[PDB]
Amino acid sequence: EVLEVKTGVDSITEVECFLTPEMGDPDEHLRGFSKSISISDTFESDSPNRDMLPCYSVARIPLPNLNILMWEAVTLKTEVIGVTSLMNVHSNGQATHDNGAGKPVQGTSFHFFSVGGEALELQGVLFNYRTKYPDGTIFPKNATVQSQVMNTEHKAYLDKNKAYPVECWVPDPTRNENTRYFGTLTGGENVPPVLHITNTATTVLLDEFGVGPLCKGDNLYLSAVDVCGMFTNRSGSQQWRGLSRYFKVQLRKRRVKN
Amino acid sequence: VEVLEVKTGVDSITEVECFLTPEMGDPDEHLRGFSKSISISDTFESDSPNRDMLPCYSVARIPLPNLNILMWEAVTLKTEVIGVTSLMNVHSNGQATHDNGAGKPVQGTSFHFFSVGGEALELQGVLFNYRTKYPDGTIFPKNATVQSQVMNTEHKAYLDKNKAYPVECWVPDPTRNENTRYFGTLTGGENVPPVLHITNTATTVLLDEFGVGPLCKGDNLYLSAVDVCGMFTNRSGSQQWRGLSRYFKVQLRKRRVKN
Amino acid sequence: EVLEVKTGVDSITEVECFLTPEMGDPDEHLRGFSKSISISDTFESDSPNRDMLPCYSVARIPLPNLNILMWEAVTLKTEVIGVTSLMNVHSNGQATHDNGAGKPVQGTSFHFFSVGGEALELQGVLFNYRTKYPDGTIFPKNATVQSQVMNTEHKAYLDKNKAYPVECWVPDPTRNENTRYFGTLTGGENVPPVLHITNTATTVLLDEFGVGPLCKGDNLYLSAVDVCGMFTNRSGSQQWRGLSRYFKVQLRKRRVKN
Amino acid sequence: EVLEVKTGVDSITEVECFLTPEMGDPDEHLRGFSKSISISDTFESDSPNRDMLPCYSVARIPLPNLNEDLILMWEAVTLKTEVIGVTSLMNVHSNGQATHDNGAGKPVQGTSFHFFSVGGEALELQGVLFNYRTKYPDGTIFPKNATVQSQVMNTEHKAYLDKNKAYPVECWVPDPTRNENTRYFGTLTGGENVPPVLHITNTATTVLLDEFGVGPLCKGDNLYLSAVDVCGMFTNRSGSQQWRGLSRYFKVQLRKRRVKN
Amino acid sequence: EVLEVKTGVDSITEVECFLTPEMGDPDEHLRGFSKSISISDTFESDSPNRDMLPCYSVARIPLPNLNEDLILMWEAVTLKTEVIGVTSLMNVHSNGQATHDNGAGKPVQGTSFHFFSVGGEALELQGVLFNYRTKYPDGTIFPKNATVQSQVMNTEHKAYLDKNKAYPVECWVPDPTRNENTRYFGTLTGGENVPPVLHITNTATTVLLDEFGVGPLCKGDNLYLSAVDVCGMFTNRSGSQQWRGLSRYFKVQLRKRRVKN
């Protein structure tokens, strides 16, 4: 039961941070990149290495203790940090033609963010149910051919960084009552990154009843994926490239019953 | 059918929540959500697609709490495609886009469609090629003529069965469907990129200009979907339709009706 | 002089119909298609076959007799019928690559519809003024080089089916006071068809003074072109492909003077 | 100072016309086309011929004479506009280059510029040059005394669009530091394979009033209409390419407004 | 503390100017262009030359002097802005690379970044590197003490845009953790074949007020304008490619606001 909003100067707080991408980081020089992508010769033999798999980013942010009152997330400012870095077309890339500049980062992208008063709830869906996911990742267990469309057994919480592969999990639409999520998948080899930045855009997190996410245990959950596309090396080999996401969340104290 | 007042109170509302799985053809035990590889006929007259190569409309008839006159009225819809990120698997028997590159992602012709109604979706048949021989186990336009390629009014049907009505044969009948709200987009082309948005903050209102939503006859709600996302190209170059499930959340209210 | 709208039960009527496309119909099996498209060696030698030229569609629809009172067209629901037929990529098409599916219908499209209380008024504009238009078509007469940009002599009414080729006629913006018209040309070889369907979308036909088309002699004129693109056969030859268009028009009785 | 609008039946007027494109017209058969585009041997030797340079179109339209007695001005309030002959681009059967073996001709596509303006005086222009060493041909009016700075911004390059078939599109843009008495709208879409997307309707109106509710005020009772509609390039069988343009329709509603001094 | 807006005729002022692009300018003839883009032999040896790197543009404009007697600040309320010389990109004849045999030259296209900001102080920057092992050249101001973490987020890389021709576009973005006194807007469109889409009009206004109705407040009576308008790349006959940029127009309306402490 949700009651009145607390007023006064000390009834509002602000959370501001960046969430770094988790693309796989195949070596000590390649933070923000995945391992080069290899292709299995059969569906059965699909066994992607961990460093070749982008994962969901998550941050649990402790808020000022209130221990009743709960912090209510009201607004979000967000954007991708470092969009201009993708203009580097001179770092040993693949020339688009004889004497031309390097092919810029492009192709399949997934841009996603969520704000919640608890962990993002996930539903597993697999492109290929026989894909063998690597040690150190948390993936849909007991997969069947029905996992390729919908298997209700695959429920999870995004409760660990560098663990939940993007391609395995989506937000669970049957749950997430205490989270607001937003995502766009743009698929295609030649898809151009279109990345907007501005400090003038605000997203309201209140639902139809004027209630935003309520932070259980005084914790705010922020989640992100920003796979911008792929970088193509001189050799033709391709790596996912990701960027950090900025979050600014304004919260207010709200009284709750039971 | 005279529409009267909406019932109020705690017990005057109900909620329907479910998913509709895609029916792309499922050519073997490992390929649920895919069609059979697409083959091309030598001539127009020899077009004879196998059943597992034809995506079909999905449909669910959902029984609602018995009311009886009162009818359940569908007011709002939340919907989205489930598993959009699976299309990031470009490492599973795909065709490299160039030497040493990643696999070609799912792309090309897509049809995304959903409808909410108080009765079965009404269909009109339109054929690309009237001489196409459609396979046993599918329900297709019968007594086809050359006019079926543009508009033959004989081809009327109800979306009343799963794995049955091929997408390429049927569209919602715009001359009917008074008690249904439907929404669809065909994006054609070999290289069309999937653009798939997800969010739990978007609601579609199902009320018409008179403030009346679909009215559920016999206390049944009808949900229909097609989500052909594009084609997957395997290493050999052969191509298969790939579909994904669609989530539906519908809010309904009790409404009194006369006669 | 436009006076008051009549109210009451019988003061409204509805028109519902479909207009079939006229793409050329080169044989008894190819309704909805044009003949294969060929290319003349020069501008002077351009002589398109009748069945290679899509034409405007028109329907004159008689309304309930009134007599002053006139039927006023207020709203329109419209959509292209059979959009899913374009998913037939298995019928004598050209493979996109080795082992691939058939190339779908794509390329130059023209989607157009109008609702009027009289025939759609046309202005002729020619891509090439030396084009010889074939017997059985109604085309701009006494063409000069100025016809390639604007020759005011080329005035016509869309008053016949299978007659007015799409490529040499457009709605006359200097006239059509009693018609509401809407069209989009999307040109280019590889342009993807984007076709939306819904029964929830209504277009209001009233002008800035709140007055819709007024039906002279109790006739409603509906016009359409839906060239969806080109179908490419095995050999690589290309044919225009069209689809039918649904119209639902709501009309009301309006009193007019003189 | 801008005062009250005059009312009554004769306090309103309408201007309706079309502006033809000026693409270069290389011969007696090619109105609406430019000459085939040729590429200079070196960057410094860029020297386009007049008939391969599209130019801005302009018409000055006389309005009903005001102030016969010993001040009223016509004020432009609304605009209806569209490109005339959009369907002509469906001619893919006339001396074109096939898109593939046995295919239809390549349609008009690629770099486009669609522009229109309505003003109570000539459209004011600012010159910007892609290449300052380009030699612009006799018969055109172009930025003079060009320097390397002309490639980005040289404030010397000021002009009025006061002549048809004269001001090359590639040299000139509306001057944003001026044009207080004009409303202008333009879109450049660059790229070799850009699809023309051309909408037509008689239901769309642009309001020409500024934030104070004042439209262009017609000095000397003259209305200035300007346009560019380069739709893209037509590619012939040989592969040579020509700009293709189309006419633009204008309908402007005007009202009498009283002005001080 | 922000108090009331001052009214009267002298309580408003206007700033109008153009910001020229800084693309590299490799020689005396190539203002608005970068040096041709070279590719490093290995990933770790990335070493772009100065004239190959587009930089952020910045202008600080002095406003009418306030507080002559012993606080009023200029408040930026509205902005009109557009790219100047969009039509110049229609020059497809200046020794470019023919799209096909006998075709016109390939137009400027590909990766673009269009950005602008209005603030009462220097735009605040955060550094993000595509490749932390990139050696950035003398004459540029770049993220120092780069680590592998610089490829995603290294909070050490803070800077002010306080110098023209200095801060490379690829190294720096607006810092979203700062910039309280600035309004910024930017779009990156990446990809070799990306078509430039450039709109111009004198009828579009951006309001600079925040949710509390307060615009940028100009410290020391100075207005800061920043821009990047990399439109894409020009391809030479030989296939070599150069960034091409254009100038940006700014018109800013300001009002006097009283401030406490």
Ligand SMILES: CC(=O)N[C@H]1[C@H](O[C@H]2[C@@H](O)[C@@H](CO)O[C@@H](O[C@H]3[C@H](O)[C@@H](O)[C@H](O)O[C@@H]3CO)[C@@H]2O)O[C@H](CO)[C@@H](O[C@@H]2O[C@H](CO[C@]3(C(=O)O)C[C@H](O)[C@@H](NC(C)=O)[C@H]([C@H](O)[C@H](O)CO)O3)[C@H](O)[C@H](O)[C@H]2O)[C@@H]1O
């Ligand atoms: C430095 C480099 O990219 N080397 C490539 C090599 O490139 C050479 C080749 O193209 C020849 C062709 O004649 O040309 C050489 O350059 C010559 C030049 O043309 C000439 O003008 C001049 O005078 O002389 C030089 C000769 O020195 C090129 O140097 O090609 C081979 C075969 O394609 C590559 O081998 C493959 O290496 C793979 C791992 O290396 C990479 C990769 O994937 O390509 C290198 C990337 O730079 C690196 N990218 C990043 C962002 O770190 C990636 C990345 O770390 C991982 O992929 C992440 O998982 O690694 C792999 O071993 C594969 O099996 C080899 O075939 C060689 O890299």
Ligand SMILES: CC(=O)N[C@H]1[C@H](O[C@H]2[C@@H](O)[C@@H](CO)O[C@@H](O[C@H]3[C@H](O)[C@@H](O)[C@H](O)O[C@@H]3CO)[C@@H]2O)O[C@H](CO)[C@@H](O[C@@H]2O[C@H](CO[C@]3(C(=O)O)C[C@H](O)[C@@H](NC(C)=O)[C@H]([C@H](O)[C@H](O)CO)O3)[C@H](O)[C@H](O)[C@H]2O)[C@@H]1O
């Ligand atoms: C003028 C020019 O572009 N020259 C090129 C030269 O082009 C010749 C070549 O294509 C041959 C092929 O057979 O054809 C010649 O023309 C013939 C024509 O085809 C035929 O029909 C006719 O009958 O006969 C003529 C005979 O002349 C062409 O003239 O090709 C070479 C090799 O690719 C180029 O050398 C390279 O030059 C580089 C620097 O030059 C440029 C460049 O990068 O291309 C020239 C650009 O014009 C210039 N652009 C601008 C906007 O200023 C740029 C720019 O200044 C810088 O890049 C900035 O950084 O410089 C470079 O030195 C490289 O190493 C050389 O290989 C030659 O330029």
